[PDB]
Amino acid sequence: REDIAIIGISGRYPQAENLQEFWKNLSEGTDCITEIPNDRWDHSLYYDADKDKEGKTYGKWGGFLKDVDKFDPQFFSISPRDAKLMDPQERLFLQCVYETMEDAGYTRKKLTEKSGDLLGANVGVYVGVMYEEYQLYGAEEQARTGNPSSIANRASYVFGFNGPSMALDTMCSSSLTAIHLACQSLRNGECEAAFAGGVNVSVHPNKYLMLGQNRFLSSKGRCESFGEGGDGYVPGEGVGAVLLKPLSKAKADGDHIYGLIKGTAVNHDGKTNGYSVPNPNAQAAVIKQALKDAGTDPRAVSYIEAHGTGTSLGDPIEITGLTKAFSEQTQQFCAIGSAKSNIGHCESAAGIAGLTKVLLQMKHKQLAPSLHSRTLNPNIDFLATPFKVQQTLEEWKRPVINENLPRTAGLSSFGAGGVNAHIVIEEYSPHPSMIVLSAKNEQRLQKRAKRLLDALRSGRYREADLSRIAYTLQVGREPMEERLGMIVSNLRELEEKLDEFTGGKESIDQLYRGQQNKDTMALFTADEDMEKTIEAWLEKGKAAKVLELWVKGLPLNWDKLYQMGRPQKISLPAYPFAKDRYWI
Template sequence: MKRRVAIVGCSLRIPGTSANSFWQDLLENKDLVTEVDSDRWGKDSFLHPDKRHLGSSYTFAAGSLGDVSGFDAAFFGLSPREVTHMDPQQRLLLEMSWEAMESAGIPPSSMRGSQCGVFIGIASVDYAYRYSDDMSAIDANTGTGTASSIAANRISYLFDLHGPSMSMDTACSSSLVAFHQACRAIVSGEIDMALTGGISLHLHPFGFMVFSKATMLSKAGRCQAFDEAGDGYVRSEGGGVFLLKEYEAALADGDPIIAVVAGTAANADGNKSGLTIPNPAAQIALMQKAYQEAGIRPDQITYLEAHGTGTSVGDPIETSAIGEALGKSRAQPLPIGSVKSNVGHLETASGVAGLAKALYSIHHRIVPATISVKNANPKILFDEWNIEVVTENRALSKTDPIVIGINSFGFGGANAHVILTSPEFDASEPSVDVEAADAECDTPLPLMLSARSDAALSAMTRQWADHLLETPDSLYDLAWTAAFRREKHSKALLVLASSKAEAAQKLTQFNDDASTQSVFTGECLANAQGPVFVYSGNGCQWETMGKHLLNESAVFRLAVEEVNQHFQTYADFSIVEELQGLNGSGRFVKTEVAQLPCLPFRLG
């Protein structure tokens, strides 16, 4: 049977928003595009409305992540000096790789020594351009800090991952081509797990100048996908990392399966009318191959997330290819859209944005609107090609399987397509009854949190206090995950609570006053091992406790008999006989009898 791939974890950096608010922003049809962050460079020095003007760009409209300078070097065991020479793209990839593993409930330390692969889409060398502007700043760490190959290799190095490790540049399709290669490595049996994704940051004006001179950038500063006003694309930054795992292994390990990869495909345009002109025949062949290999009929496709950049040439070619490959073979028009209308074009990481929208759509069973269509592009023959743009949020079936395709095309002709399907169980519904999850437990449960520093622990408790009040998950599930599926760090905290509300209250009290008696803090022991003896007080005993062990375990019986020998000096009955129930019934109501067998029972 062909191996399948599950997406079990992910981490995102989306311009103009956060990973937590991205979905809500899509549902609210928000435009998240602004301008290049003011701290990157002096925009006024390089901005000119005439594209023929030397050394300038006619736009700096962009989707921006804002300040990307912050990084916790110590957390990853790196020196501040080395980090200053590391491209912020490398730094963000390290953060997102950690977060992707933790989001899957897999402690990163448990991955050490594994055959996990790393496949990263990356193209920008803006950080290297900054050093070319000031060569006196170059030192021994600049080479590894600015090399694209190290973006993947550093992840493998720091997390001790031994599978294939590669960075790839196919321009705007880089992250989806990387995703395809990761899936193929898992399907072939070469590896069982992979970290894959992409990154793109604006750290130098060079990219804006290059694409401005080629008239690729929108003078309106927006990706007006499928609209007659489409005049180019807007550059955006962002990224994401996905943790992929062989499907059966993910099921066996109890990992959260966000979506299943039904198929992937990649090809190239070959020779055509121009290097950067899309080839519709290649796009048609790509999509047909992907769905034929996946065994999915065009009528089974729920939605297709198009490349949809908003260019006057690219949009009509892509939509015609979608119609020819899929739309015309359907009874109903194929719904399509483009997240670039919300966030802009993340270039090498654009596939990440498309995948993220698809994953949220599968989980919530809603396709958000494409917000750019005011007047449909007359060159797109929607009726003839049997396609339609989703211009309003569209609810999907609550029970039917969901199939979503994602297109991603590079400007040099490297193309990729990914097909995602909903998990075989209904992941859109909470796994627990919300009222039951909010109910109090019979006994307090231990919620254990840990971090690398006191400041980080304080920040984590604030996040957990909010999360406890918002999540539908039960306190038991949350406490179990925190204890067994999270990394253990040096600074630890323990709170005992019978409900999520009580746990949140105690964590909030701790943030207000770290000396509160309701929360316990301490240092985690590294590589703790060996026996731990815990003796409870009176009240836990029951008649004939240990009877089975006395009969079945020689070690247990010897220990009890040894204590009994000492005990006989002070009492007129045998503990061995007491545990066997040979001294009569109802004797444990007497304190002088009930407490005495507890010690030998625990020692045994």
């Protein structure tokens, strides 16, 4: 039994352009749920007062993205005329796998470096999705479509992974089952690494129809997590992805770590009284099992990212289920919160959004609030119980060894179609340098700088990790067609340059830019002596003179920058994407 390290993350959630700004909304508790946009359907096309007609609901609104209908087709070697015929589900994931790629800090050449096996060394893809909405395609109009397995299968095809690719389905906890199966696929050693994730979108009113006939939603149309007005919940859209691999190799091939999936668990509810009822006895049977193989006490755990459904039946049952698990051997106080309060009920991205929240709570060392918990349903009799609802933003402290310990936190998600799953996460404890950067065309060049600027503006890193930032952009970013690099030793000389690109195209001797000229590729690669000259270029370390050749395309084996050890990775902004609409 081996731990799994999570090295790369990304995702797109209501009122969140990137993870940076998602955390903002969680930390400043901000209701991200908003009115139905004009671009989707005729808002004013039919809606109903509470529980009356056949054809409509009291569908107030829900969590949505500005992003949804856009893609950069030609980036992935896909033609625009085939982009017309594609699923928002599939792009959003592809795009957000590729951001996870680079937030982890690994190239598409990832696959050749691991094994002399054969083409593109195995990588798993596990995503858990729903009904696509564009099958509702003019069904009166011939669609010039249908598969939930094309999501993972394109992602593997495009990037060239030789590892399992599939689309799971468990009603709510699909994302988290993927987590489970990914982790399962790693311990036994069938695959090296995995892209686990979940995707959810709200595109036809059939989603909003079906959800209202079976009364799962509230009149208010908000997520009240453990609140007093505990009536039903709203459907937030969402998409997310994470990159997983064993701790065993995460140390050697220094990789940047977000957290450790130390325990995984999943089961079904046996026969409940109704179809869509959850069984509290069944819920601890997961969580006991999550903590069994994790080998960590219930008294270690300091936070539970609950599947806060918010229904009158659902939330009390969860709390009672959580109680039974923790009451077997101890009676520290654990914090309970929900991401599902801030964003909506990711239908299939429930676990991944929660996971994302959990991991964002780890990096900034803080406990974010569960919104709409001002007053608590009288059936929350917190009855000598370890749990407590997390009202507000406070600093996260580590429990002590004295009571006779690392940060430890659980993650729940439970299907209406009874499938229950729980995951348990723990936190892991001069020279001039070459800032090289690349893209596919002209105009995406000083956005890619602009986004690196706006990070260094806010000051997310200090001077100490300059070699780390450089190293990433060299080996763990793709050497694309258009190029740019710069020379630094610095704190301040980073921004002195970046602002000059935003300011204009002006040329001080600090800029090197190029593409192109093919005399040299065949000259440079198939020869032993010119590689000794690149070896001999590092010996001296005169910087500017080589970077002229990089921007003109010199491919080079970067691993020769090395002190006797190569410094570990870092979270840098992923490639910003094009804004071309595709629909109908």
